[PDB]
Design a protein around this ligand. Structure first.
Ligand SMILES: O=c1ccn([C@@H]2O[C@H](COP(=O)(O)OP(=O)(O)O)[C@@H](O)[C@H]2O)c(=O)[nH]1
Ligand SMILES: O=c1ccn([C@@H]2O[C@H](COP(=O)(O)OP(=O)(O)O)[C@@H](O)[C@H]2O)c(=O)[nH]1
Ligand SMILES: O=c1ccn([C@@H]2O[C@H](COP(=O)(O)OP(=O)(O)O)[C@@H](O)[C@H]2O)c(=O)[nH]1
Ligand SMILES: O=c1ccn([C@@H]2O[C@H](COP(=O)(O)OP(=O)(O)O)[C@@H](O)[C@H]2O)c(=O)[nH]1
Ligand SMILES: O=c1ccn([C@@H]2O[C@H](COP(=O)(O)OP(=O)(O)O)[C@@H](O)[C@H]2O)c(=O)[nH]1
Ligand SMILES: O=c1ccn([C@@H]2O[C@H](COP(=O)(O)OP(=O)(O)O)[C@@H](O)[C@H]2O)c(=O)[nH]1
Ligand SMILES: [Mg+2]
Ligand SMILES: [Mg+2]
Lengths: 154, 153, 155, 154, 153, 154
């Protein structure tokens, strides 16, 4: 588990509408993770259905896609050690009802269909989702000035 | 199911220590709707009725005395599963067993000074709301972000 | 001398309630050292609102101002402290958020003068009038803060 | 003053390096302004020289361009009534020494060459800077759920 | 029991990353009383003496050199069960196992960069307090809200 | 030069009693200044009377000294460019009734006799106050990881 692991984090349209962009970004920023890509986007329905392709047969799929289209999305790539698993921990349980206070959903969300944000569930799915949402040149290369104080190793 | 209501009270120690704002913000930020609120020092008969289950406990008179020792911020919050999730936001009744990030896990130490109260069940909530609030004190309104907080109900 | 039991009437207008600013606004007054002695969430009738703004009944914005004050709940409060009337106004910021300084309530949270989130009594005498208009006397709670002697050097 | 006025706000590399992305966004989010475009970019030097074209003969021009190249930049377009003028007020004085606490520079910055952020200084400069930093399809059209609570008119 | 004391230290990474304020506020808001604090760069022998129980395990020389790499904010906090609740506030020793809401759950990632230290037992706290502070550096005072934090001493 | 300027900041007993230690430190931390010395201390009356020697003939002197004895004090030395003057601006006006919201006294204080904090009013007075409150070995020399992002030059 190296310090250059990457995950895809998105602020869903409800998170944008409810003014949660700053506080969500600060949650990852304060943790020590590094933002290498970010853009506000309103992606087409095809991209969103590809993003959720493994859920294309679940009954909430059509409503989830329609809701993911209903507003802007803040799409992000965060880099850091174990950023995929720890990122999921920071977001909280997929259903906010099972989320703990102190996580994103435990502080801000209630309904699973309005759970404010998305986080890649695996290293492999993160690479696929990063490629789906970003062009390679949208990922910025830089090194944080506090790298050696966040990490004891590479 | 999103119109479930619960009774939340800031106890006198929470008022004395300046926790009214932070506690309200916990429920506001989560997405619940405030439908009734008032700062009160209720009569002792109301407090004894509120804690009627514990009237024979050894700490009952001391609990009633402390609940009379300062103002109380009484609130009704509305939202899906607000009773159970409201209890989770407050944290364990004994702060020593509470997790940081909850109200008691951030601000409280002693179980007799746990700064807040929350109804433990939908049925108990309906009693406590009727005990603490007149019907005309519950305000009916629709949040501008209701459809962004809830997908249904 | 201006004593520590001066009182003012602070109200969170319907837009402040709708945008989730109840907690933040109360914290500004809590953190400053002022004491909350009365508070209730209320939906007052139009007559009460027109009385509250009686001195502006001839202003061109009065009709929409009253209607907007009826469009949602109001969090009505009485705060107690030394110079709480004037200092309360400073905390709220300029009536028009365009001319308010960041760090005040309006300088942090509002834009339009018709959506300036909050209200505060502009004088001691008008504070006493507004407190009686909005609250019954037995809704004002008498209590003493545990940190009174650390907020105040004198009565 | 119409509510659809736009301004360009940028978080300079020192603001990104010092973990101020979340706090700065929240300042504009909490005030009621609308984010219509955002991206983390490492722009080419020609774009930076054009952005600061008025200062191309100043003695600190080359040092300014070099520091603007030293890290990622969070570029944003915010929309709201008088967002250009009020945005400069939210940022505080260009020299943080003359800035008041409660503004961004009054809370986070000290040196004028490290003042963490940029804001358009006029309506027409905003249009020029928006066109320079953003493709027109990067501005997202949407309506805030609390628009009628922030604004009394159009 | 409300006079229990623990040793809390902000490690050089916490100082370097500008976390002194937030960490103090975490203990301050819980209701604990700060009775001693100083910014200090202790000698290597004191650091080796502090982690002497882990002297022959790995990561030892690296831990000492890192604890020497910057200033340390040493603190003594006082309150009921402050040793155990203090550790709960810090979060799990390895930040990857900590929960959001704790100090490490909000701010840290690597166990070798876990921002803070807290005594793990009442007896180890007394030793660390004696190791890090002279007796006259512990200040005696009573919080104005002591009776609103505690129901009993 | 001037980036190593130092001032004396103290959190008075009322600031300690009201649980404001964390917030006050965060104001200076966030601004970019470097904490080089700090201790919780209960100084004797002679040190307090020497600190306020230039006020021994003001009528509020005796009450000021006895109140400065009534609880612990958090004494600090902060380092940064113009930290003396900018420190005063961060604290706010001496009388909190004249302080602007967003400063420390504008956010937390009311009475001038309970104005929470103290800051050196001049470079020359800071040096005398620093030597009065701290031994030279209590000042810790270190280099902030983000020094080059806070300052453009020494
Ligand atoms: O019953 C369900 C399950 C999921 N979702 C939504 O579908 C997304 C993707 O579901 P997944 O199982 O991938 O959970 P996640 O990986 O997002 O935690 C979730 O974030 C929810 O917003 C939903 O609306 N209803
Ligand atoms: O040993 C105890 C148990 C409870 N309480 C107080 O009594 C209240 C009611 O306790 P209950 O069992 O109903 O738990 P809750 O419903 O408050 O979570 C608690 O919140 C405490 O404030 C107390 O002082 N001592
Ligand atoms: O041109 C104006 C002036 C005022 N108002 C509103 O009506 C109130 C009138 O209050 P006043 O002019 O007495 O100033 P305030 O005491 O609120 O600062 C203001 O707070 C605003 O909410 C408005 O909508 N338009
Ligand atoms: O003496 C100076 C003046 C300006 N700048 C930098 O150049 C930018 C552009 O200056 P301008 O006059 O446009 O002020 P702004 O419009 O950014 O407030 C400033 O923000 C600073 O970052 C600088 O480094 N030194
Ligand atoms: O594998 C490890 C275990 C611990 N530590 C460090 O050594 C300290 C002491 O470890 P201990 O087992 O005492 O845990 P603690 O009591 O600090 O929670 C920890 O806080 C870490 O900073 C480390 O660098 N690597
Ligand atoms: O009428 C006064 C003036 C000052 N003070 C206190 O004594 C200090 C005197 O400091 P000075 O007048 O030099 O101003 P400062 O340097 O603190 O801004 C103030 O900070 C207050 O805490 C007071 O109690 N009454
Ligand atoms: Mg999935
Ligand atoms: Mg008026």
């Amino acid at each position: 588990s190296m310090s250059n692991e990457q995950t895809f984090i998105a602020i869903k349209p409800d998170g944008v509408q409810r003014g949660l962009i700053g506080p969500i970004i600060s949650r990852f920023e304060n943790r020590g993770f590094k933002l290498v890509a970010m853009k506000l986007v309103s992606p087409p329905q095809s991209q969103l259905e590809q993003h959720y392709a493994d859920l294309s047969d679940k009954p909430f799929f059509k409503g989830l896609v329609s809701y993911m289209l209903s507003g802007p999305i803040c799409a992000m790539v965060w880099e850091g050690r174990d950023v995929v698993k720890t990122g999921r921990t920071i977001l909280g349980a997929t259903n906010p009802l099972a989320s703990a206070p102190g996580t994103i959903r435990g502080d801000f969300a209630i309904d699973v269909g309005r759970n404010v944000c998305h986080g890649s569930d695996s290293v492999e799915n993160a690479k696929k989702e990063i490629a789906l949402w970003f062009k390679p040149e949208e990922l910025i290369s830089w090194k944080s000035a506090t790298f050696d104080w966040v990490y004891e190793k590479a």
